[PDB]
Design a protein around this ligand. Structure first.
Ligand SMILES: CCCCCCCCCCCCCCCCCC(=O)O[C@@H](COC(=O)CCCCCCCCCCCCCCC)COP(=O)(O)OC[C@H](O)CO
Ligand SMILES: CCCCCCCCCCCCCCCCCC(=O)O[C@@H](COC(=O)CCCCCCCCCCCCCCC)COP(=O)(O)OC[C@H](O)CO
Ligand SMILES: CCCCCCCCCCCCCCCCCC(=O)O[C@@H](COC(=O)CCCCCCCCCCCCCCC)COP(=O)(O)OC[C@H](O)CO
Ligand SMILES: CCCCCCCCCCCCCCCCCC(=O)O[C@@H](COC(=O)CCCCCCCCCCCCCCC)COP(=O)(O)OC[C@H](O)CO
Ligand SMILES: CCCCCCCCCCCCCCCCCC(=O)O[C@@H](COC(=O)CCCCCCCCCCCCCCC)COP(=O)(O)OC[C@H](O)CO
Ligand SMILES: CCCCCCCCCCCCCCCCCC(=O)O[C@@H](COC(=O)CCCCCCCCCCCCCCC)COP(=O)(O)OC[C@H](O)CO
Ligand SMILES: CCCCCCCCCCCCCCCCCC(=O)O[C@@H](COC(=O)CCCCCCCCCCCCCCC)COP(=O)(O)OC[C@H](O)CO
Ligand SMILES: CCCCCCCCCCCCCCCCCC(=O)O[C@@H](COC(=O)CCCCCCCCCCCCCCC)COP(=O)(O)OC[C@H](O)CO
Ligand SMILES: OC[C@H]1O[C@H](O[C@H]2[C@H](O)[C@@H](O)[C@H](OCCCCCC3CCCCC3)O[C@@H]2CO)[C@H](O)[C@@H](O)[C@@H]1O
Ligand SMILES: [Cl-]
Ligand SMILES: [Cl-]
Ligand SMILES: [Cl-]
Ligand SMILES: [Cl-]
Ligand SMILES: [Cl-]
Lengths: 497, 506, 531
């Protein structure tokens, strides 16, 4: 068994130490997450924001340049999968818990309260601000990490390790040293917290649906611990892959379920209004793109700092911490692809899905607010989806299917994250071990479950703050990854000819 | 000649079926017009607004691509005219009744009343919202229908028919079958209504111009029909005596008269303020482009849908319905041009016209408002050009001139458009029959009049509601054209030659 | 090479006359200046605004076009300076008295007062409206003139003269003719007034700065004169010892001082507020670029006119008149560069320095407003920097290196500008006469002085109105350059050969295709009904 302990030890130490400090000393850890938060959002907020937009310029430039004609693998190697399966796999890429949690909440919030530098009840700014958090910006980050890997791996022939994409800068000798193995630590850690966050929101939201439907009175810690345990244990099993039910038949299910949800709302809901929001969202997104990118704590006369720390800066941090996972995943399905094909696919396909989704769920929630039938309730994110569903014919049933799609996501995403996390802790092995995979998943579900307990009534608040913290170091890794990718792409063979 | 009665008849039925319904049962017609207008604007407005902007994106990307080097004709062919003569013909294409009618009215209305999403009395928004309706958007559609007809006619030797452009998707068999014919019929229907709308506006506007010159008490019904009838007959004269002699000669009048109005107002009006609106309009239009693109019934907190229906969605439908004609015209003058050079020319050249024309008329109207000398009057579009004219030295004369210009425009527009309808009904014959041509000119002017009459006090509202309803089926044609055109260009030999030299070397 | 007296005299007369009109009849000069301002802003205001943005597009299109592969010199000639030294000389270039004077004041002013079409206290608009006046728009102008001069001199091998750039429209006999000289004359007149503006600005600021350090409280003309005199003398004793030597070591102090000034206020002031304004500036700039570009006197319901002639248009005018100098400076340092390289550097680099400079100072000056610690004093630009500095731990010491800088900048600017004028009055001669250099230098300082004196209590308003009236003619020269520049690059050997190989290849391609097509028609004819 090839297990790089120099990276697995410090990684697992940070994880478990965070669990002790969380489950044991509630007040202590919940206070730490709130002051480190302010520390980062006030002193490094300008970096998350400035470079987040640089990632977008950089990535489409790389595509416009000659490096785009280059392929990922041997010279003039054909794509592994046929286009239609590459594209369809970038859908399950787009879909997920985040869109289940914020689909209704985010657009609804921005419409009601308004957004820094605009007044309340502005549909366009609501839709555009949402698109902004879920389209080009996150996937630019996913393309950077994904490319750096896919190139360092298929083309140049290195190990599928984040530290191997840093060779052009740190030398073949760095990746093997401590720095390369530090990169792999922060990679796994970021993935843990970035994934845990997802698991938290997932459980936090299902427990709410258990109350919406009256299967439960009101959720308690013993309920969230109940959900997380069933889903975690459901993961431990499926992690040790069987035959009949596989990780890629859950994606299929995820799809049909997600599709059933979306279609349902779309049809029974206000249809042409959702249709209006398609051009509506896109027009306004492009219209406000640079304004939104210019927003800082200095915006709206020194006022926007807090709104930022609860939305934009949270998402960026989250997107960063989640990059190793999504990046590696995007590499593993894009071998044989050209660098220009790869980027255009990453930036446009997932954006299609998120657009349609927020137009449906965000759209309906806003169409309710305009007709004096607010689904807002007591203003608790977790509840809002079920609020929207129960407001429509047959909405009773669809609320339960919603609970399942969430549980299957919990497990579907638990596998993917764990696998990659293992690959990164085994010197870059392709098919990781089912006993480290399952091990990482457990600690990932543990971390997540913790941030909900420590938080308590500020669980969502606590879930976010901690993410922004664990993602800060890795932010610079992704930044340097631009240079290491530029040096590599320059030292290529075709490009020299 | 070779008449395609299978096409002509179903197209001639609906038209006459409309004149009888409208001139026979005013109320039953106006009740259907206003009813359907609502179903289309409410259920399909998203479509006009989403694809209206997809068109602009599409046609620009096409030009940016390898397909751009291809030529509208045989390999390495070259243009028949100098590019200067090409530009001049596109300049003169940018003019017409629509500019006359809406040149003063539009940017004024937006300034007085304000625009959904904005405060009233906003100059930049008034102009940018106008540009939006009269530049890139309409010509992106003309370009799309032009490039399809040209590439089909000059690059592949198919008939100069719209259905021929759908060969890559429908096949040779299909383009001779029903689907192919349906496409040709919707083309002719869209052309007659989209043109009748032009003739209608013109008739209304000239009738209103008779009153401002005090040559009549009131634009009454037995006067509008008298205007249409006289101009219609003058079209017959110009039609039998060779359509060629008329169009080219009247265009001369058109450009001479038009140039006079424009320079008169430019020199006698607030010259400097008009000049400021040049970079003014361009800067704002670029600034607010995507903002305007994204506007729908959901915009402005869910309140903007009605404005949309009276403006944006109106124009889109109108540009769409007119596309077969102005596209066939764009093809017939653009052979041997490169696809890329063609796309840029069609977008930019007309834009400059509208841009200048609106800065002169709209800009002057706005300056009047600002200085407590509003020209708005009773708030009726047709009266407002004459409003602005009579507010100037010598304007009483120029008001007569603008009447003649509207008359010529009426005739050159019916000439041009009727020719294309000939071609579309004679299996793609370039020179139509002077009888099949004149036949269309009458049916068209008759529909123009049937729209005005059936309306009553709201002729304009009726003239816009029917146009939107009519143009609705053909919006989907133009959408599929995109898919058709890309399939063709992908099969083209020269471009297949470059992805052939890029798969070998690389 | 001989002095071109036919070009020298007419310029020196226009200048000397102005100095007379101003210092002789303060009340006849001020009037004409103020009446001509109106005439220009009202009638040509649209042209500055339209073409100011046209310049930006034009130069971006050139760089993107095939023209951008052409090298400014012999075919595949290597650059005189290395890539890293050239860039640095563009950093140092972008820093001037303009940055010192307006650095604090401009965004502060926009934040407090707002700009047409917006309300006060808009941080984004404050920063964006500033980027507009100090980034792409002026350096496009510079890039254009620099290119026309670099390509004309280094590639075609002509005289280093603006009249040369018009050879492809006017001819070698046109450039030697009256119009050609007229161009050079206007290029001189434009430069002296443009530099004079920068020199006046310097005096007003270094003057207010003596009264802020409480070193002088005799606020009068005998003091402003006392500054333009000492510094002018300093100019005459630097262009006499060797202008080529001073410009170097004198400039290297100009940067460390600028760097101490910058780093100081960045470290002591609201550091993470400033960092915040970096992406806040760039983003808001991109966001409002066209909205700003569309701002005319019909904007804000026919109201923006007044604000326009004090900010946007005065800057456009200022950048135009200063272009013969800046562009020539750029040409001379850019030899061996590709047109694209050059354009991409002239644009992107000075933008970096302006963006950071305005974030540090202007940003600091806005954070104070938000905290009720408002600087502004009596609302005077000339004082605001020193004001800002004083409210900082060290504002007294650093509020004096600012004094030095302004003087040092005064000298460096006068030296650089005077050289270009010499070359421009000596048939494109690189190293120009010593007494003819100091001559223009003195005369240029005389105008700046005059502008301030004829001005009175409103010295700026006068200093600006003139800079605008003296730039007007040269706006048409810069427009003409677009046409000249295109004619020239179109007849460049390397481009002609390229467009020639495109034809041959298409022709060659067509032969291969059309024949193969002929063969298939035969091969099909045999297989079918036949075989
Ligand atoms: C509204 C929605 C968003 C749309 C955003 C898209 C708009 C941007 C489009 C920009 C297209 C530019 C043209 C693309 C082709 C460029 C080809 C190119 O220059 O490649 C260079 C490579 O360029 C880069 O990778 C660096 C640039 C990356 C992007 C930086 C963006 C910074 C963003 C800051 C804000 C934006 C403004 C500044 C843009 C520069 C070549 O480098 P080299 O070979 O000289 O390097 C040798 C190496 O040093 C050897 O070791
Ligand atoms: C909604 C519209 C849908 C349209 C669907 C159209 C379907 C057909 C699209 C094309 C299919 C065939 C693709 C291959 C042929 C065309 C493309 C091609 O091969 O030509 C190249 C040439 O294309 C171009 O020159 C376009 C350059 C502009 C790209 C700018 C990047 C995007 C930034 C957007 C804003 C930028 C604005 C900057 C200035 C304001 C494109 O590659 P490249 O530009 O990445 O490479 C450059 C060089 O040739 C090879 O390295
Ligand atoms: C008015 C609206 C503005 C936004 C929308 C603009 C309209 C859309 C235009 C999109 C299509 C543009 C297509 C341009 C293709 C030009 C290609 C060409 O012919 O010249 C060369 C390509 O030209 C270039 O290299 C890029 C031009 C220089 C960089 C771009 C201009 C400077 C921009 C600086 C920023 C200033 C503007 C910022 C905001 C726009 C050929 O490419 P290459 O094979 O030499 O490229 C190799 C590459 O350099 C290395 O891989
Ligand atoms: C200040 C904002 C930025 C400026 C605006 C964007 C500027 C984009 C400039 C794009 C490059 C223009 C090059 C000019 C031609 C010089 C000679 C030349 O090099 O020819 C090339 C120039 O050819 C082009 O790239 C044509 C690009 C067409 C872009 C169309 C933009 C139209 C926008 C219209 C907007 C109208 C708005 C209305 C109000 C103004 C041919 O090569 P290619 O690039 O076609 O090759 C690519 C590929 O290998 C084969 O396709
Ligand atoms: C009508 C435009 C209104 C918008 C605002 C414009 C304000 C200025 C108007 C200037 C003319 C606008 C464009 C009018 C159509 C094109 C006119 C043109 O450019 O010349 C045409 C000739 O135009 C005319 O004879 C009638 C209109 C004349 C207006 C332009 C020429 C004016 C000549 C005197 C100008 C006086 C001032 C300058 C004197 C040097 C065509 O010449 P051609 O032989 O190349 O054309 C071949 C084509 O197939 C013919 O159909
Ligand atoms: C073809 C359609 C439009 C397309 C674009 C065409 C553009 C063609 C080029 C036009 C360039 C004109 C640039 C100068 C402005 C012209 C208008 C003008 O000068 O002011 C007008 C208006 O004049 C005024 O109201 C007063 C202006 C006073 C200007 C005084 C300037 C001289 C001041 C003396 C000192 C100058 C010192 C200069 C030192 C360099 C005078 O026009 P008008 O007399 O023909 O008509 C008057 C009005 O429209 C109707 O009665
Ligand atoms: C705007 C209102 C008044 C109208 C004024 C006139 C301007 C509008 C009309 C514009 C029509 C032409 C637009 C450009 C079309 C070029 C498209 C093209 O053909 O691609 C070529 C790209 O290359 C070029 O043709 C470039 C043009 C050659 C000269 C280059 C000049 C560049 C100058 C750029 C300055 C732009 C400044 C504007 C900025 C706002 C390569 O194909 P080709 O057919 O030219 O092949 C070459 C030859 O024909 C045989 O093969
Ligand atoms: C949103 C951006 C849109 C950009 C515009 C499209 C970009 C270009 C896309 C690439 C090429 C498009 C044209 C070809 C697409 C399909 C591939 C192809 O080559 O077409 C053939 C293969 O096409 C296909 O396999 C399926 C494509 C369907 C055919 C095209 C449909 C056009 C859609 C029009 C929508 C109008 C809606 C009307 C509703 C009443 C068609 O021949 P067929 O005999 O096989 O017929 C197709 C099928 O059997 C019919 O059932
Ligand atoms: O060569 C003729 C060929 O025609 C067939 O195509 C049919 C098939 O039904 C079908 O493949 C084809 O439609 C495919 C694309 C449909 C686009 C129709 C557009 C019409 C205009 C409005 C936009 C849409 O329509 C044709 C007519 O019904 C099939 O391609 C073959 O069976 C046959 O060989
Ligand atoms: Cl390759
Ligand atoms: Cl061809
Ligand atoms: Cl405005
Ligand atoms: Cl809105
Ligand atoms: Cl702001």
């Amino acid at each position: 068994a090839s297990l790089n302990w120099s990276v697995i030890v410090p990684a697992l130490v940070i994880v478990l130490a965070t669990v002790v400090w969380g489950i044991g000393f509630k007040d202590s850890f919940t206070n730490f997450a709130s002051s480190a938060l302010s520390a980062v959002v006030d002193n490094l907020g300008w970096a998350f924001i400035l470079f987040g937009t640089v990632f977008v310029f950089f990535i489409v430039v790389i595509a416009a340049s000659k490096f785009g004609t280059i392929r990922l693998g041997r010279i003039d190697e054909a794509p592994e999968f046929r286009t239609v399966s590459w594209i369809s796999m970038m859908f399950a890429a787009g879909m997920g818990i985040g869109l289940m949690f914020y689909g209704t909440t985010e657009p609804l919030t921005f419409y009601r309260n308004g957004v820094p530098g605009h007044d309340e009840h502005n549909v366009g700014v609501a839709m555009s601000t949402t698109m902004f958090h879920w389209t080009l910006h996150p996937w630019a980050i996913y393309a950077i990490v994904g490319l750096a890997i896919a190139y360092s791996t298929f083309r140049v022939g290195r190990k599928q390790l984040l530290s191997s994409a840093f060779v052009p800068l740190i030398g073949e000798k760095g990746a093997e040293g401590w720095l390369g193995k530090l990169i792999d630590i922060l990679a796994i850690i970021a993935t843990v917290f970035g994934t845990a966050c997802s698991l938290g929101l997932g459980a936090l939201q299902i427990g709410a649906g258990l109350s919406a439907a009256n299967i439960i009175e009101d959720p308690s810690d013993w309920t969230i611990v109940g959900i997380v345990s069933v889903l975690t244990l459901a993961f431990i099993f499926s992690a040790i892959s069987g035959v009949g039910k596989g990780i890629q038949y859950l994606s299929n299910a995820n799809m049909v379920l997600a599709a059933l949800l979306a279609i349902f709302v779309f049809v029974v809901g206000p249809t042409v209004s959702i249709l209006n929001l398609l051009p509506g969202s896109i027009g306004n997104y492009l219209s406000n793109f640079f304004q939104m990118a210019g927003r800082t704590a200095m915006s709206a006369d020194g006022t926007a700092g807090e709104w930022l720390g609860s939305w934009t800066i949270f998402y960026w941090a989250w997107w960063i911490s989640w990059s190793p996972f999504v990046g590696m995943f995007l590499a593993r399905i894009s071998r044989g692809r050209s660098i220009r094909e790869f980027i255009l696919g990453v930036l446009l396909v997932p954006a299609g899905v998120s657009t349609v989704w927020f137009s449906i769920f965000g759209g309906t929630a806003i169409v309710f607010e305009q007709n004096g039938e607010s689904i807002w309730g007591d203003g608790a994110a977790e509840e809002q989806l079920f609020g929207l569903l129960h407001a429509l014919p047959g909405g009773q049933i669809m609320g339960i299917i919603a609970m399942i799609l969430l549980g299957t996501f919990f497990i579907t995403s638990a596998d993917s994250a764990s696998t990659v996390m293992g690959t990164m802790s085994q010197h870059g092995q392709l098919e990781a071990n089912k006993w480290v995979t399952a091990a990482w998943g457990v600690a990932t579900a543990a971390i997540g479950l913790t941030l909900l307990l420590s938080g308590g009534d500020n669980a969502l608040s606590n879930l976010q703050n901690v993410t922004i913290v664990a993602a800060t170091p890795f932010l610079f890794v992704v930044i340097g990854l631009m240079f290491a990718l530029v040096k590599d792409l320059s030292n290529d063979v075709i490009y020299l000819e």
